[PDB]
Amino acid sequence: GAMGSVSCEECGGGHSPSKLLLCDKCDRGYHLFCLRPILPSVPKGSWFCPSCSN
């Protein structure tokens, strides 16, 4: 089925969907390469963005 309409909050882009991480609280999307610090690959297990990791 189709992907959802999510875009990266940092760059506004919906490209590179295999690297577009969804936060397990706020559900906003962030490309691995738009995060700072940068992530080199999709993390194993549940993942939380900086605003939600607390």
Added chain:
Amino acid sequence: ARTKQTARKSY
């Protein structure tokens, strides 16, 4: 972790 790529239905 979930990504835009994985966030879809596969029937």
